[PDB]
Amino acid sequence: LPEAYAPFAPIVDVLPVIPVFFILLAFVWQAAVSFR
Amino acid sequence: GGRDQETTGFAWWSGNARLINLSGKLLGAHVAHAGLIVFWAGAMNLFEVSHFVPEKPMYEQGLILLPHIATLGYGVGPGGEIIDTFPYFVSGVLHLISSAVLGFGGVYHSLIGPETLEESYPFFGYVWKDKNKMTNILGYHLIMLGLGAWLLVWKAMYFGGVYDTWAPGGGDVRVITNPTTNAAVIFGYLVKSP
Amino acid sequence: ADLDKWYGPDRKLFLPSGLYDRSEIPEYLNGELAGDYGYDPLGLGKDPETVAKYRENELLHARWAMLAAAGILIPEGLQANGANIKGGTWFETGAEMLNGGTLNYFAVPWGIVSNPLPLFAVIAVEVGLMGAVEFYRRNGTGPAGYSPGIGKFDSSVFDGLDPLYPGGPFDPLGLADDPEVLQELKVKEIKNGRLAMVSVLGFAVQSYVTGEGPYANWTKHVADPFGYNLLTVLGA
Amino acid sequence: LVDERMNGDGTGRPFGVNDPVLGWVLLGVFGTMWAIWFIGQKDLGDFEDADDGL
Amino acid sequence: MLTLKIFVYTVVTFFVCLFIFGFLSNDPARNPGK
Amino acid sequence: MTSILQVALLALIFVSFALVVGVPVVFATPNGWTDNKGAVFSGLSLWLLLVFVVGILNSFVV
Amino acid sequence: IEFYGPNRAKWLGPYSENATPAYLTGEFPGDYGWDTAGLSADPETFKRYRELELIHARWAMLGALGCITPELLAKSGTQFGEAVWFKAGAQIFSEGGLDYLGNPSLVHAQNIVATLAVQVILMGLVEGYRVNGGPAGEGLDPLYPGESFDPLGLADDPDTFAELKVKEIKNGRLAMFSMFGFFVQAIVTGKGPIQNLDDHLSNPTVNNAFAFATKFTP
Amino acid sequence: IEFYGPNRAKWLGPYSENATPAYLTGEFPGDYGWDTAGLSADPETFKRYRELELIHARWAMLGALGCITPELLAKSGTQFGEAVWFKAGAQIFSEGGLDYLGNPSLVHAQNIVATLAVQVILMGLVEGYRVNGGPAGEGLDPLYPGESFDPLGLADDPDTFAELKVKEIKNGRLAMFSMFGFFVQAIVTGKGPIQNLDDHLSNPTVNNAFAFATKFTP
Ligand code: CHL
Ligand code: CHL
Ligand code: CLA
Ligand code: CLA
Ligand code: CLA
Ligand code: CLA
Ligand SMILES: CCCCCCCCCCCCCCCC(=O)OC[C@H](COP(=O)(O)OC[C@@H](O)CO)OC(=O)CCCCCCCCCCCCCCC
Ligand SMILES: CC(=C/C=C/C(C)=C/C=C/C=C(C)/C=C/C=C(\C)C=C=C1C(C)(C)C[C@H](O)C[C@@]1(C)O)/C=C/[C@@]12O[C@]1(C)C[C@@H](O)CC2(C)C
Ligand SMILES: CC1=C[C@H](O)CC(C)(C)[C@H]1/C=C/C(C)=C/C=C/C(C)=C/C=C/C=C(C)/C=C/C=C(C)/C=C/C1=C(C)C[C@H](O)CC1(C)C
Numbered sequence A: 001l002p003e004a005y006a007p008f009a010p011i012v013d014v015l016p017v018i019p020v021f022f023i024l025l026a027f028v029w030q031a032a033v034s035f036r
Numbered sequence B: 001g002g003r004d005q006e007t008t009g010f011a012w013w014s015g016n017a018r019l020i021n022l023s024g025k026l027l028g029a030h031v032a033h034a035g036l037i038v039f040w041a042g043a044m045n046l047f048e049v050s051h052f053v054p055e056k057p058m059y060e061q062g063l064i065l066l067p068h069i070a071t072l073g074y075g076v077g078p079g080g081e082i083i084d085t086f087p088y089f090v091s092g093v094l095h096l097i098s099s100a101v102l103g104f105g106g107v108y109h110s111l112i113g114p115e116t117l118e119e120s121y122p123f124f125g126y127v128w129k130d131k132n133k134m135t136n137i138l139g140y141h142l143i144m145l146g147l148g149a150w151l152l153v154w155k156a157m158y159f160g161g162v163y164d165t166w167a168p169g170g171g172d173v174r175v176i177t178n179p180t181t182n183a184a185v186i187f188g189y190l191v192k193s194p
Numbered sequence C: 001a002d003l004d005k006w007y008g009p010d011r012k013l014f015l016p017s018g019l020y021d022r023s024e025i026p027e028y029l030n031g032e033l034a035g036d037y038g039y040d041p042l043g044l045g046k047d048p049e050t051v052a053k054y055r056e057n058e059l060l061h062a063r064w065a066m067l068a069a070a071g072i073l074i075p076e077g078l079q080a081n082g083a084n085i086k087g088g089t090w091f092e093t094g095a096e097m098l099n100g101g102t103l104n105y106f107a108v109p110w111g112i113v114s115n116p117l118p119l120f121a122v123i124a125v126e127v128g129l130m131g132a133v134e135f136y137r138r139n140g141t142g143p144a145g146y147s148p149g150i151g152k153f154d155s156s157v158f159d160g161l162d163p164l165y166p167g168g169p170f171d172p173l174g175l176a177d178d179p180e181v182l183q184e185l186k187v188k189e190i191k192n193g194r195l196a197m198v199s200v201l202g203f204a205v206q207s208y209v210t211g212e213g214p215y216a217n218w219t220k221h222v223a224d225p226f227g228y229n230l231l232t233v234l235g236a
Numbered sequence D: 001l002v003d004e005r006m007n008g009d010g011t012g013r014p015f016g017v018n019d020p021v022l023g024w025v026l027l028g029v030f031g032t033m034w035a036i037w038f039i040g041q042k043d044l045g046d047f048e049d050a051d052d053g054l
Numbered sequence E: 001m002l003t004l005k006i007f008v009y010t011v012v013t014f015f016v017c018l019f020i021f022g023f024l025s026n027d028p029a030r031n032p033g034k
Numbered sequence F: 001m002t003s004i005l006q007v008a009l010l011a012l013i014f015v016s017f018a019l020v021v022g023v024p025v026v027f028a029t030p031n032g033w034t035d036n037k038g039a040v041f042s043g044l045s046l047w048l049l050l051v052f053v054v055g056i057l058n059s060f061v062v
Numbered sequence G, H: 001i002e003f004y005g006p007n008r009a010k011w012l013g014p015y016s017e018n019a020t021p022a023y024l025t026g027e028f029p030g031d032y033g034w035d036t037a038g039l040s041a042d043p044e045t046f047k048r049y050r051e052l053e054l055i056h057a058r059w060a061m062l063g064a065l066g067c068i069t070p071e072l073l074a075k076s077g078t079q080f081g082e083a084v085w086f087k088a089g090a091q092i093f094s095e096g097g098l099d100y101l102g103n104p105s106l107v108h109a110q111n112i113v114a115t116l117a118v119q120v121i122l123m124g125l126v127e128g129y130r131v132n133g134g135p136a137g138e139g140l141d142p143l144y145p146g147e148s149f150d151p152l153g154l155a156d157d158p159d160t161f162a163e164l165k166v167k168e169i170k171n172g173r174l175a176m177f178s179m180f181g182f183f184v185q186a187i188v189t190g191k192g193p194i195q196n197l198d199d200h201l202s203n204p205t206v207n208n209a210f211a212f213a214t215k216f217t218p
């Protein structure tokens, strides 16, 4: 990080794993109706 | 009815195939997907910006997206040195913001917006049989890709320059003055043996 | 189609109908006007009596703003490419005629045409000619002659019906005679007007902040699109 | 040299063509096959909008 | 070798042109159909 | 000026939390577009204002 | 001197030659009766040739005045560079652009194929509009539209309008005859027409036509 | 039928007066309506112009292909003396006569006045036979006979032959316009036409035509 955005260095390191969770969100959303 | 198994005839693991006759929800699916692509392009870029070290060579750090910007030549000098990080930061943050707009549009069409645009919008509506309309949409996509190619041409010809690797004294960013557009040379590469 | 897209109930609004309800429109607008997008989030014209003078102010500001947006650039557009005209920065164009200024010509025609400096018989001439024209727009019939266009000011003026659209001697070609063509040109006039209106602020706030040439903003920004932004000027 | 050979490796020529004698054979087969197909077009389905799809 | 090379190009381009002008020649209607 | 960035950034992140939590719930409720509509309008407007304010302040940060 | 009816001013004159080519007795402007090669006996052909003569006259006025103007400007007060109207077409390749009126502040154009691509599209659209209307007044008269084309209205009185027809075609055929002289003394002397006139005002006949008359001996 | 009828594809699209010229509406192939001069108001004149245009077309196709073919073959792998159709005629005078295909064991033709005599005799024979009707076909149609010099027999159906008429005329008009292009290029650049194509494809913006724009300066 170049400048005063430096204290966001924890929440930057969570960002790229977030797009994978949409598949699991779709599976949980279709399990919510018990797959029907 | 719409999101049903026994009427649509498709199971839960073939759920996207229930959108074959649903233009608005199909559009929302695509725009949400483009939001995912732009969001990954922002997130991995800012991850590599946060983990980037400038004194160390770029291939020794396991980075893939920052060389794609350094090849265009933002924030680089002669010999392949790295002088700045703020262009990389801008290229991350702009994608990370625009992904929110695309995600909002995708969720709006996929939840509230109308299923069939062919009823109240005779422009955006389309039937899979309508060959003239399919060629229309293909024409719009080709025009957008042509402007996408001319953006790269303008960045090479007028805006700053591109990092050549064949400049003497090490690689260097230079401005292309005479792009060789000989047809007998350029249509050689498409035909040469693989 | 031509009148249907820009009049009636189902005209184009300033938001999509998926963001509207198509019944939450402020009810005193209801079409029948060119340039009607159902746009009033605050309600500054809630009586229909106010809408008449707002039409008048809108049309006057539009017709001044178009000429302003043309003349704010075209002499500067000549000088930055190399004309002989005295300085084209529009905010300093006034303080060049102060005690000894000249000018030039060739908007459409030829000719480098100087001017023997008339300034003190220009200020009062502006005041007198506008004191003619503005009271004529209020009520005054004015003189009649000097042959512009067709008609050539036959007697004085109409019997009425024209608070904003006289059109008698003002069509040298008879442009709008069909009502639908008239309505098309109404919509085009109000749209080009409103864009000129927003463009005037687009020149003005640049003249506030940057203090540079507005036509020169082209030759700086299109030349260098990352050397001239807000982010290069505000921080300095 | 010692012997005789085409020396066609590493050249980068379109379709591997060296002679124009070698080049004419491509068109001389392609055009005749196209002509036989275009004659055989008589006994096929040509139509205004009778399209073969969903 | 050139006598061989003309013959190889002839056979290859004959079979490839037969392929392409076969598939242009009304393929998805030679099925059992409906 | 650093704190002027960081308070606006925390506000932007928390507004984004509010969007990601509520806006799918408001959309998926069968009358949520009728009920919570001006709230979504004001939330999107506040989000855009925070983005533009952070973007303008990053020029003044030297 | 009525230029209509049986007493139009014949081109011959005193040998007025009654029993003319008998398919015309006035009634259209320009009619004298001079049909010696005999090409327009049919009425439809005669209508086509009225059309073609009128359009060539109305182009030839502009083609003559555009050769009158710039050498007079070079005489009086201006700067052009390639001032002669032959080499004025080659002002794109000249130095760095085409300075209209010699002012490098306005257009200063290059890219001859871009100028030609603008020209062909604009002229095709305006000629199609000249054929069958569209905008700018619907197609009402194939030769004499006048509706949007009278910002002054000189077509009020019918006898004066016929007089303006006859003056129009009299002042057209003169320009059409002059432009062929431009094109011939283009090839013969190579030089400017006002250059030749400024030679001929000074010199009565010592440089007249016949010094420039021994060219094509092979 | 789209190609001819009251709704053919006219020569300006929507800008074709929204009306034909008032004497031809279909009934013949190649009819778009472009007689703006009105030269064919009489039907026998119009028939003579078709009978002339078709023969100019059928000669213009062969005149195209016989000009193209030698710059293909000689520049590819053979020898023709000179293959450019300027110097195709001067191959009799050159060294030993005209070696057809560059082979001094077939024809090897000399004696140009004898070749001229054979041409005059045989072309007199065929151009008399085309008018009256002689051997290998009786005179029945001056333009579309349909006899022993049409061996494959494609003109049996009326509609397909009506389409092939329009195909022949369209290719004919294209061949004539191309041959006019060959002749004007032959005047201007003095080079072969396929040589002009290979010179234009190398640098399309500067070897366009406008480099050869100051050749004919007076
Ligand atoms: C009774 C006397 C009288 C005579 C002799 C003429 C003569 C003519 N008038 Mg007429 N007019 C006359 C009465 C009147 N005219 C007019 C008003 C008009 C008009 C408006 C017009 C004429 C025109 C004509 C011409 C018709 C034929 C033509 O085109 O010639 C052209 C052919 C020749 C002159 C023959 C060429 C001979 C020439 C000397 C050869 C040059 C020799 C060279 C050295 C050789 C060159 C060598 C080669 C290699 C280049 C002819 C010159 C028309 C015209 O101007 O046509 C050009 C025309 O538009 N007249 C009026 C007013 C009412 C008259 C009343 O008196
Ligand atoms: C609606 C748009 C439209 C326009 C603008 C045109 C334009 C034209 N079409 Mg057409 N077409 C159009 C629709 C269609 N056409 C056709 C199919 C055809 C055919 C088959 C033909 C045409 C032809 C023509 C021409 C008819 C008039 C003419 O002969 O030009 C005369 C005017 C000029 C030549 C002026 C050109 C301007 C140029 C800048 C001149 C260059 C100047 C040089 C410097 C001069 C050189 C100087 C000297 C010293 C050497 C004209 C160029 C005819 C044609 O082009 O034949 C050659 C023709 O045969 N069209 C179809 C399919 C149905 C159309 C459908 O929309
Ligand atoms: C990225 C891939 C993707 C996308 C875009 C979609 C999209 C869609 N699927 Mg789908 N699906 C997917 C993967 C995907 N699916 C996978 C992997 C499976 C296999 C498990 C399925 C199985 C499946 C089935 C079985 C069905 C669908 C259906 C649908 C459509 C309607 C969904 C619905 O009812 O919304 C309503 C959604 C909800 C009520 C849940 C709330 C979800 C919220 C909106 C999540 C948003 C989170 C995000 C952070 C918000 C950002 C906001 C922004 C402003 C910040 C929709 C267009 C259905 C259909 O055809 O429609 C008729 C259907 O029957 N899908
Ligand atoms: C990229 C373009 C693309 C698109 C738009 C589609 C679109 C479609 N396909 Mg399809 N497909 C694609 C590529 C594509 N496919 C490819 C590349 C393959 C080869 C593998 C297939 C193989 C395939 C089959 C075999 C079938 C389809 C079917 C379908 C239809 C319904 C899909 C659905 O709802 O499944 C819902 C989605 C799921 C259930 C997702 C399951 C997840 C998979 C199995 C593994 C995910 C791996 C992942 C990367 C692991 C990450 C790490 C992990 C630890 C989390 C739909 C029209 C089905 C159909 O009925 O067509 C009419 C069908 O039978 N497709
Ligand atoms: C290409 C994708 C796409 C398509 C085909 C549509 C099509 C449509 N949208 Mg829509 N939309 C999109 C993307 C798209 N949208 C996105 C990304 C968003 C999020 C901002 C929205 C948000 C949105 C809302 C909130 C609503 C619609 C509605 C509608 C429907 C009618 C009204 C309309 O078009 O005005 C929408 C007009 C605009 C959003 C103006 C766009 C602004 C300019 C033109 C963008 C120019 C950018 C340019 C193309 C460069 C590309 C950027 C980048 C990729 C390089 C119409 C079917 C309405 C509806 O459902 O009514 C029934 C509705 O209420 N849209
Ligand atoms: C030998 C030349 C020739 C002749 C006699 C004809 C004859 C005819 N054409 Mg035709 N045509 C030709 C060449 C010719 N064509 C060429 C080369 C083209 C392609 C551009 C066309 C395209 C064409 C169209 C599109 C149409 C015709 C039509 C017609 C018929 C009525 C028009 C008429 O009276 O023409 C009389 C023509 C002449 C007497 C020829 C005069 C030749 C001299 C030398 C003057 C030509 C100078 C030339 C214009 C200068 C520029 C040349 C360059 C453009 C090539 C008539 C049968 C119409 C029709 O119904 O078709 C049957 C029609 O719509 N023509
Ligand atoms: C280095 C550069 C490399 C360039 C590679 C170029 C690849 C070319 C690929 C062509 C694909 C064509 C697709 C099929 C095209 C097709 O669908 O055919 C069909 C089409 C006509 O279809 P229709 O049947 O509808 O015709 C209308 C009437 O027949 C309707 O009844 O014919 C063409 O348009 C041919 C177009 C030119 C094709 C090339 C010319 C062919 C002849 C040239 C051979 C010369 C013979 C010389 C003899 C010695
Ligand atoms: C914005 C603008 C407004 C112009 C207003 C005018 C001209 C009012 C005239 C206003 C003129 C007026 C009122 C004339 C008045 C004449 C009068 C009273 C004289 C008179 C008579 C008599 C004696 C014969 C008697 C008769 O019985 C009555 C009457 C009346 O006939 C012009 C801008 C530009 O000119 C600039 C500034 C710079 C250029 O580069 C750009 C452009 C755009 C061209
Ligand atoms: C009548 C009769 C009858 C009898 O019976 C027979 C006879 C005798 C045959 C006849 C006659 C005829 C005649 C005389 C004719 C003539 C004509 C002409 C000359 C025309 C021109 C015509 C001419 C013309 C148009 C011209 C035109 C021109 C122009 C446009 C120009 C243009 C231009 C210019 C601006 C200049 C620059 O630098 C360039 C250019 C671009 C180039």
Ligand SMILES: CC1=C[C@H](O)CC(C)(C)[C@H]1/C=C/C(C)=C/C=C/C(C)=C/C=C/C=C(C)/C=C/C=C(C)/C=C/C1=C(C)C[C@H](O)CC1(C)C
Binding pocket: H034, H035, H036, H037, H038, H039, H056, H057, H059, H060, H062, H063, H064, H066, H067, H085, H088, H089, H175, H176, H177, H179, H180
């Ligand atoms: C229609 C119309 C109408 C209106 O009204 C009017 C007008 C306009 C007038 C018209 C038009 C017209 C036109 C355009 C025309 C054109 C034509 C042409 C060009 C032809 C060619 C045509 C052309 C042609 C034939 C050509 C031919 C050729 C040939 C044979 C060749 C031969 C040869 C060869 C092989 C080679 C060798 O080595 C030699 C030679 C010997 C050289």
